[PDB]
Write a protein that binds this ligand. Structure first.
Ligand SMILES: O=C1c2ccc(O)c(O)c2C(=O)c2c(O)ccc(O)c21
Length: 325
């Protein structure tokens, strides 16, 4: 398998662009940034609102939990490469504690409106707007030859007050190289593509589009998460109960994958459940044929069949967002 777009980005660029292990970190001043208040956690980190003591500017302080040198270089390089594309978090500085050597990444200040409280109040328009803004971030990073690999509500930081969106936490992200076989232990369960769940290692940018599809499905249907599985096996079962086992079987044949017998047993036999069957009185004001047409083209077993981020932005669903933009 290979990506249908931007396959050759890291083929044509200098090796220095993607060769993150060769990076040597320029450590800034640890004392320049003070913790003001804890604001949350990333995947392998604790995150704080901070202040730059030189100019009193707000910042984000991301203190990383102990991890391998390779992994920190990967995040830092990807962040330097993507500074400052549309709706990407801005890495400002990298510092560390002299004694314990625990590193901190410093970002431009990002405010956070809790998604669990925010999503119920989004209007039909707001969902078109914010997904479009997310799509800009994704098209940009894909065009720079990077997959995010952990798209989810928490990693899409919305400031509803100021109507800003930031794609955050690039700690699971990777450079795309055609044919390369990746670790499937990425993303978060509810937002893991079928490729990850069936051990298809040579995946690409299209992984992020499944994850967005899952977020978009949860928004319009107000069912969150949309696919609510307990473990990785059950997460596939939940997908198969909506999309149907027939489409799964043609997908597994196409890429020549055999399911583990226990997983195959757990998956079983299911019919496709039309998207319209998820509509109810709570979400009717959000579900339109354009929303469903868009969702349908995102939640596809076959990663090659999914809309690219660039294609998605031009779908008539976002027509009013473009026209206003
Ligand atoms: O801004 C980030 C932020 C900015 C860049 C990151 O890499 C990141 O993980 C976070 C982050 O985890 C975070 C959070 O967990 C809670 C509130 C936040 O404002 C953030």
């Amino acid at each position: 398998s290979k990506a249908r777009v931007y396959a050759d980005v890291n083929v044509l660029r200098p090796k220095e662009y993607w060769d993150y292990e060769a990076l040597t970190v320029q450590w800034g001043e640890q004392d320049d940034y003070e913790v003001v208040r804890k604001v949350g956690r990333g995947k392998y980190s604790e995150v704080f609102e901070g202040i730059n003591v030189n100019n009193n500017e707000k910042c984000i302080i991301k203190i990383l939990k102990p991890v391998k040198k390779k992994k920190i270089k990967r995040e830092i390089k990807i962040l330097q490469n993507l500074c400052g594309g549309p709706n990407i978090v801005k890495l400002l500085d990298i510092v560390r504690d002299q004694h314990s050597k625990t590193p901190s990444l410093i970002f431009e200040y990002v405010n956070n409106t809790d998604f669990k409280v925010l999503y119920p109040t989004l209007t039909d328009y707001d969902i078109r707007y914010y997904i479009y803004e997310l799509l800009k971030a994704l098209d940009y990073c894909h065009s720079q030859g990077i997959m995010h690999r952990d798209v989810k509500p928490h990693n899409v930081m919305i400031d509803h007050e100021l109507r800003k969106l930031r794609l955050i936490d690039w700690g699971l992200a990777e450079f795309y190289h055609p044919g390369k076989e990746y670790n499937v232990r990425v993303a978060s369960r509810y937002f893991k593509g079928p490729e990850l769940l069936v051990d298809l290692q040579d995946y690409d940018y299209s992984l992020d589009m499944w994850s967005l599809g899952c977020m978009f499905a949860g928004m319009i249907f107000r069912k969150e998460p949309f696919f609510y599985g307990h473990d990785n096996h059950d997460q596939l079962v939940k997908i198969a109960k909506v999309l149907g086992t027939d489409g799964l079987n043609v997908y597994l044949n196409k890429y020549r994958i055999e399911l583990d017998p226990q997983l195959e047993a757990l998956v079983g036999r299911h019919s496709r459940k039309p998207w319209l069957k998820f509509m109810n009185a709570d979400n009717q004001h959000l579900v339109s044929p354009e929303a469903i047409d868009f969702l349908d083209k995102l939640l596809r077993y076959d990663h090659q069949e999914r809309l690219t981020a660039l294609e998605a932005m031009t779908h008539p669903y976002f027509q009013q967002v473009r026209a206003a933009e």
